[PDB]
From a paper:
The cytosolic sulfotransferase (SULTs) family catalyzes the transfer of a sulfate group from the universal 3′-phosphoadenosine 5′-phosphosulfate (PAPS) donor to a wide variety of acceptor molecules bearing a hydroxyl or an amine group. Sulfonation results in inactivation of the majority of acceptors, including neurotransmitters, steroid hormones and drugs, thus modulating their biological activity and rendering the product more soluble and readily excretable. Of these, the SULT1 family is the largest and is responsible for the sulfonation of phenol, thyroid and steroid hormones, as well as a variety of xenobiotics and known drugs. For example, SULT1A1 displays substrate preference for small phenolic compounds, while SULT1E1 shows a preference for estrogen acceptors.
To obtain detailed understanding of the molecular basis for the broad substrate specificity of SULT1A1, we solved four crystal structures of wild type (WT) SULT1A1 in complex with different acceptors.
Numbering used by the authors: 7 to 295
Write the structure that this text describes.
Amino acid sequence: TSRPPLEYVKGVPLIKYFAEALGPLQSFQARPDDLLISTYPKSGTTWVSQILDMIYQGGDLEKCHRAPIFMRVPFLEFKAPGIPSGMETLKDTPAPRLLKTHLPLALLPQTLLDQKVKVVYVARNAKDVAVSYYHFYHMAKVHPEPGTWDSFLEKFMVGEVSYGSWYQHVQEWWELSRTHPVLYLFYEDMKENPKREIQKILEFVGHSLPEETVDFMVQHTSFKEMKKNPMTNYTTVPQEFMDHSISPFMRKGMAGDWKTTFTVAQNERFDADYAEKMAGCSLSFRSEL
Ligand SMILES: Nc1ncnc2c1ncn2[C@@H]1O[C@H](COP(=O)(O)O)[C@@H](OP(=O)(O)O)[C@H]1O
Ligand SMILES: Oc1ccc2ccccc2c1
C-alpha cells in the first residue's frame, strides 16, 4: 500500500493500480478516428501529447489550457488514489480522441488494432530513458522503491521495472508498423529539430496548418514553456501522488545527460548487454546530438 510492489500480468510487471485498471479497460471500444500515443515511459509521452493537442485545437493555446494534459488525453490503463481513472476520463472526452498508453502489445486492447487506429509512437535512447525513469520513480510515489541507481539500472536491464523491457517495447512497436499505421518518432529527433517532426506529425494526421501556426506550436511545446505550463507540468496533481520537490516531472528535457549519471563501469556493461539485445534490429538510436 506504501510503494507497493509491481504486479505481473501476462509477463508484464505493472503498477498494481494499473493492472486493476485492465478490468474496466476490457470494455473499451476504439473508434476509427481515435489516435493512440504509444511510448515506453519517459520517452516523450507528454511532449507529443501537447504537440497533438495543439494540432487538434488548430494552434489555439487557450483551448489547450482547458485542462491538464492527463484529462485532455485519456491515459488508457491509468488508475490512482484521488485521480480519475483513464476509463472514467475517457467517457467525457470528445471525438476525435487522443489516447495515451505504455502497454506492451501483449496487453494492448485488441480493439485498437481491429479499428486500425493511427498510432504515434515515440522511442528514446535507453540510457536517457533509464535515468529519467529512475528520477521518475522517486517523485511518482505509486512506483516501488527504486533503490540505488545501480540496482535500478540492473533491474531496468532485465525489464524488471514498471511496464517491463524497454528493449522489447521499442522493437515490438517497430515491427507492428509494418502491418499497422504507425508514425515512429524519436525523442532525439524532436530535440534536434522540433519543427521537422511536428510537420511529420501533421502529414500523418492529415491536417495542414500555416507556418505562423506551426512556428507558434514549436515555441509552446518547448521544454521551457512546458515546464512553465501547469496544464502540462503535472504540478496540479496532489503532492501524495507526484512530489516535484523530490524530482520535477519536467526535469531537464535534454538528450545526452545520461553521462552525468552512468558510471564508466555501468556504461561498458550496459553497452555490451545492449549490443546483444538489439542485434538483428534495424532500429538505430542516437544517445546524444
Ligand atoms: N517539451 C519537452 N521537451 C523535451 N523533453 C520534454 C518535454 N516535455 C517533457 N519532456 C521530458 O520527457 C520526459 C518525460 O517523458 P514522459 O512524458 O514520456 O514521462 C522527461 O525527461 P527527463 O526526465 O529526461 O528530463 C521530461 O523532462
Ligand atoms: O506515463 C505515466 C504518466 C504518469 C504516471 C503517473 C504515475 C505512475 C506512472 C505514470 C506513467
